[PDB]
Design a protein around this ligand. Structure first.
Ligand SMILES: *[C@@H]1O[C@H](CO)[C@@H](O[C@@H]2O[C@H](CO)[C@@H](O)[C@H](O)[C@H]2NC(C)=O)[C@H](O)[C@H]1NC(C)=O
Ligand SMILES: *[C@@H]1O[C@H](CO)[C@@H](O[C@@H]2O[C@H](CO)[C@@H](O)[C@H](O)[C@H]2NC(C)=O)[C@H](O)[C@H]1NC(C)=O
Ligand SMILES: *[C@@H]1O[C@H](CO)[C@@H](O[C@@H]2O[C@H](CO)[C@@H](O)[C@H](O)[C@H]2NC(C)=O)[C@H](O)[C@H]1NC(C)=O
Ligand SMILES: *[C@@H]1O[C@H](CO)[C@@H](O)[C@H](O)[C@H]1NC(C)=O
Ligand SMILES: *[C@@H]1O[C@H](CO)[C@@H](O)[C@H](O)[C@H]1NC(C)=O
Ligand SMILES: *[C@@H]1O[C@H](CO)[C@@H](O)[C@H](O)[C@H]1NC(C)=O
Ligand SMILES: *[C@@H]1O[C@H](CO)[C@@H](O)[C@H](O)[C@H]1NC(C)=O
Ligand SMILES: *[C@@H]1O[C@H](CO)[C@@H](O)[C@H](O)[C@H]1NC(C)=O
Lengths: 49, 464, 49, 48, 95, 48
């Protein structure tokens, strides 16, 4: 689970990896079930006021 | 050794300059000329030279050299800012509700980081904003032979930076996270470059007068003549040697850009602040991956399968660990901010007393007698070009602190007494210029029979 | 990792990274092993095998 | 201990920084002459 | 102090080397005034150097020359008193 | 582990602050050697 914007990616996941993770313990991209597609995760915007 | 058992390096009897420090005076390095191995040796402190002390000999230089040295000072660092609630407890009301029960712990951290960020702009403002007006240089560069084009801005460039500070920006090299943001500085690089252009133009066209009051134009050879008069060399030195001095100054300025472009690690003092901030931020990010005891380090996974009545302890462990890590980061940044503020105060002092004045404090604006200084902006700091007077070649002269005339003892109004061995001359102290000793450059006091080590000569009274 | 090699006899020098094929849920204990070769028949004496 | 992350790499780094700077302090205070000067054998300093 | 993970590293400059530095600085001062801080060390008779330092406060050199014996005696005495002061007052090295 | 680690952090922090103080003193000592030893200071009560 998580929140963010989901975008087409050109990161060639090799047949064995199912989800990539950042330098912190949070996902950066995933593979969709039922269609087996690579999907980029970018955190959706935030900032101070 | 006295520092421990060292294995791998051959001990060499002879001494060299220190390259890689070991401790207790031993250093090591890679020779490559004699030894293609690693040698270790006792340091040499420098060359031995006895000085020719005697009770009756002086050494007065016959030439000089004008040297430009460079000094790099940090002024500010990146104004970072981090939010507790997202950093520790990202997008989870369930953990934020129990973060609230820690009270003010990290309204306090936000306050501290905001204080640092506000202080960085004050650092830059105090260093650079020393001029009430923006001064400009005239279109025609008739500076009596002095070439300043290496430090004045070039109109042909998209950014109005001089070649040297362009080189600096090209030599020092500087993402989206959870809760970490970087605030832009208040003064952009264009604005800081405009400040340094104002300072340089004011210096060139008005000496130090623009630091005290209204800027008063003076011709540049005349200004430099005054600064020579400042360190004890009569202006005729500059006027008779102006062409040589201008060529020498131009060559020294030209050498600076080549030195900066060819010798790395020159801007290490400025690269270190960005390296340290980057390292602290990287560590603060990497601390988010630590369990601290949690069944899982990622928040939503422990929340998603464990009912709150017992997932609360699991969340609490993570909360305390991350909060403590953030606190450590903030404290480290407070100490480093104190250090950078000390450096920025030193940079403000140096601008005041080397750029806006001519300093009598030895080795404060570079080695040698200080003439004048040029600021150049650098990313997150300032570079000073210190122009100094250095003696070059000396001769040994016999001396005496007084002269007898018809029983009367004369002392120098200015300078010292010297001789070739046949005839006695008075000269100023930093540049060999003999003159016949007259009643109008020495003064009378006492009689011969009191001072020790005095010589007989004739002194000429212009009236007869 | 399968690589066409030109070096004379031994392992090459170029760095190459192996990537997984399979993860079999065998769950047995393994302490010894032996490779399986493919041998031709050059000749047949009547009883030797 | 491994589960606390880099708390110890940080402390070792900070103490190493302090220790390295302690040598820079002495180098900057005392290493202000490029060559070692020596006093003459005879001490004729005019009474000093 | 140093039994359970605490260790003390040796300083880079040994005391003989620091004493050699201060001997260099003091010898340069005695034999060459302030000239060796700016450029090449220029030998200068020490009474003459003190005369110019006096001149650096607005007292004409003729002062030092007319009473050099007295000034040198007084300076020797003042240096000697430092030894006794350090040897007799405790807490002098408190900082 | 928690107690000893936090004790070590306290020690390192106070050492950092004390090192900053010693650095300020060392910078003052370098300034004093320059301006009093290598020169003559016209600056009152700085060199005695
Ligand atoms: C003063 O300084 C400069 C540099 O040390 C000397 O200038 C040189 O003068 C000679 C004779 O006029 C020229 O042929 C050289 O080309 C000059 N140097 C350069 C780099 O152009 C000058 O002689 C010095 N005076 C003394 C006494 O050393
Ligand atoms: C001012 O300084 C610079 C460097 O000393 C000089 O710039 C050179 O100008 C000429 C003619 O425009 C060019 O051909 C050169 O390529 C420039 N130098 C470089 C490194 O690009 C300029 O001439 C100087 N002015 C004086 C009077 O010396
Ligand atoms: C200044 O005076 C002294 C003595 O007259 C000279 O010192 C000598 O310098 C050379 C070169 O550095 C050494 O090899 C000698 O050993 C020194 N003398 C002694 C006794 O040690 C110095 O050269 C003089 N300068 C001039 C222009 O004569
Ligand atoms: C799920 O249905 C889609 C629809 O065509 C199909 O492509 C996919 O193979 C199905 N999932 C699996 C695991 O076969
Ligand atoms: C260093 O000097 C000693 C003194 O005799 C000598 O025994 C030794 O061999 C020398 N070592 C080298 C590497 O010169
Ligand atoms: C020193 O100056 C005198 C005075 O003119 C001169 O006669 C003498 O030749 C000079 N000494 C030398 C070595 O040239
Ligand atoms: C300098 O020392 C010499 C010793 O060779 C002595 O004869 C001479 O009187 C001294 N000069 C002065 C001015 O003390
Ligand atoms: C200087 O003159 C006085 C008297 O005029 C004389 O006694 C003394 O010897 C002279 N000095 C020298 C070096 O001859």
């Amino acid at each position: 689970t998580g929140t963010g914007v989901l975008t087409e990616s050109n990161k060639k996941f090799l047949p064995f990896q199912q989800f990539g993770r950042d330098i912190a313990d949070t996902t950066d991209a995933v593979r969709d079930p039922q269609t087996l597609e690579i999907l980029d995760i970018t955190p959706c915007s935030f900032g101070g006021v | 050794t006295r520092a421990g058992c060292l294995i791998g390096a051959e001990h060499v009897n002879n001494s060299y300059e220190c390259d890689i420090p070991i401790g207790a005076g031993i250093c090591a390095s890679y020779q490559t000329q004699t030894s293609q191995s690693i040698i270790a040796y006792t340091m040499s402190l420098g060359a031995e030279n006895s000085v020719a002390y005697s009770n009756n000999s002086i050494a007065i230089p016959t030439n000089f050299t004008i040297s430009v040295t460079t000094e790099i000072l940090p002024v500010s660092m990146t104004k970072t800012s981090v939010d507790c609630t997202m950093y520790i407890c990202g997008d989870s009301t369930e953990c934020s509700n129990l973060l609230l029960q820690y009270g003010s712990f990290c309204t306090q951290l936000n306050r501290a980081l905001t204080g640092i960020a506000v202080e960085q702009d004050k650092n830059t403002q105090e260093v650079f904003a020393q001029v009430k007006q923006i001064y400009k240089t005239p279109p025609i560069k008739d500076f009596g032979g002095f070439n300043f084009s290496q430090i004045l801005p070039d109109p042909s460039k998209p950014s109005k930076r001089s070649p040297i500070e362009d080189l600096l920006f090209n030599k020092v090299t500087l993402q989206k996270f959870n809760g970490l943001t970087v605030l832009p500085p208040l003064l952009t690089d264009e604005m800081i470059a405009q400040y340094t252009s104002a300072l340089l133009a004011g210096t060139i066209t008005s000496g130090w007068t623009f630091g005290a009051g209204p800027a008063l134009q003076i011709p540049f050879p005349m200004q430099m003549a005054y600064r020579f008069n400042g360190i004890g060399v009569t202006q005729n030195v500059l006027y008779e040697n102006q062409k040589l001095i201008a060529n020498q100054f131009n060559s020294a300025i030209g050498k600076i850009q080549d030195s900066l472009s060819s010798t790395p690690s020159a801007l290490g003092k400025l690269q270190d602040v960005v390296n340290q901030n980057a390292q602290a931020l990287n560590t603060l990010v990497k601390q988010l991956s630590s369990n601290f005891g949690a069944i899982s380090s990622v928040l939503n996974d422990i929340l998603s399968r464990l009912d709150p009545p017992e997932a609360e302890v699991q969340i609490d462990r993570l909360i305390t660990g991350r909060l403590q890590s953030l606190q450590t980061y903030v404290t480290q940044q407070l100490i480093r901010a104190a250090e950078i503020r000390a450096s920025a105060n030193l940079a403000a002092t140096k601008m005041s007393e080397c750029v806006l004045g001519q300093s009598k404090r030895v080795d404060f604006c570079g080695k040698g007698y200080h003439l004048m200084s040029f600021p150049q902006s650098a990313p997150h700091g300032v570079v000073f070009l210190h122009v100094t007077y250095v003696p070059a070649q000396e001769k040994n002269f016999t001396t005496a602190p007084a002269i007898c005339h018809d029983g009367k003892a004369h002392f120098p109004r200015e300078g010292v007494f010297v001789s070739n061995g046949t005839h006695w001359f008075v000269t100023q102290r930093n540049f060999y210029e003999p003159q016949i000793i007259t009643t109008d450059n020495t003064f009378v006091s006492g009689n011969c029979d009191v001072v020790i080590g005095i010589v007989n000569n004739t002194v000429y009274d212009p009236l007869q | 990792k399968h690589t066409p090699i030109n070096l004379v006899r031994d392992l090459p020098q170029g760095f190459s990274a192996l990537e997984p094929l399979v993860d079999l849920p065998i769950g047995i204990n393994i302490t010894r092993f032996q490779t399986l070769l493919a041998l031709h028949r050059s000749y047949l004496t009547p009883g030797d095998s």
